[PDB]
Design an enzyme around this catalytic site. Structure first.
Site, PDB file in Angstrom:
ATOM      1  N   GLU A  11      -2.337   0.733  -8.782  1.00  0.00           N
ATOM      2  CA  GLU A  11      -1.588   0.215  -7.648  1.00  0.00           C
ATOM      3  C   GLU A  11      -1.953  -1.207  -7.235  1.00  0.00           C
ATOM      4  O   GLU A  11      -1.232  -1.851  -6.479  1.00  0.00           O
ATOM      5  CB  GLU A  11      -1.852   1.069  -6.381  1.00  0.00           C
ATOM      6  N   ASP A  20       7.535  -2.763  -2.951  1.00  0.00           N
ATOM      7  CA  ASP A  20       7.094  -2.112  -4.142  1.00  0.00           C
ATOM      8  C   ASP A  20       8.198  -2.180  -5.150  1.00  0.00           C
ATOM      9  O   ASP A  20       9.220  -2.815  -4.906  1.00  0.00           O
ATOM     10  CB  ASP A  20       6.515  -0.701  -3.903  1.00  0.00           C
TER      11      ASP A  20
END
Ligand SMILES: [Cl-]
Ligand SMILES: [Cl-]
Length: 162
Positions: A11, A20
């Site tokens: 991540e 994202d």
């Protein structure tokens, strides 16, 4: 190698609000803020999460605190899910890490739905499972990461991450 180091690779760490791959507002170590399009709704959520007026920016410590809470929640959501618990209980410690990874990323519900792969996982049929996980929106949107997770399940080792 552990779940923290593993999710940190997958991540990344960002100290300023960002979108994202799905277009959603996020911060730190993959911590979703909101599925809403308003940067304001997102600043709002951030401050409430942090406990202070951030102005869309947090410290590393702060990011690590959210992450700790998020991993903890993932593990607990697994242990409480009727579909999940049993899969987990049957697996080794590496493969458990992989289950936690998916859960962190996509939520209990999301994973709880991969019915066929869960069964194969359970039956320890490593190869077919890996083929099955690949036919997913999840793999198609983020194939590098997905490959990493899938390999981890298949092999039962941390190779993909080393
Ligand atoms: Cl939170
Ligand atoms: Cl990717």
């Amino acid at each position: 190698m552990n779940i923290f180091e593993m999710l940190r690779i997958d991540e990344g760490l960002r100290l300023k609000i960002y979108k994202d791959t799905e277009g959603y507002y996020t911060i730190g170590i993959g911590h979703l803020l909101t599925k809403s399009p308003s940067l304001n709704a997102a600043k709002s959520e951030l401050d409430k999460a942090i406990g202070r007026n951030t102005n869309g920016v947090i410290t590393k410590d702060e990011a690590e605190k959210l992450f700790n809470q998020d991993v903890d929640a993932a593990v607990r959501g697994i242990l409480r899910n009727a579909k999940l618990k049993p899969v987990y209980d049957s697996l080794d410690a590496v493969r458990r890490a992989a289950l936690i990874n998916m859960v962190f990323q996509m939520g209990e519900t999301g994973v709880a739905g991969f019915t066929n792969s869960l069964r194969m996982l359970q039956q320890k049929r490593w190869d077919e499972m890996a083929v099955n996980l690949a036919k997913s929106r999840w793999y198609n949107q983020t194939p590098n990461r997905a490959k990493r997770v899938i390999t981890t399940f298949r092999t039962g080792t941390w190779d993909a991450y080393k």
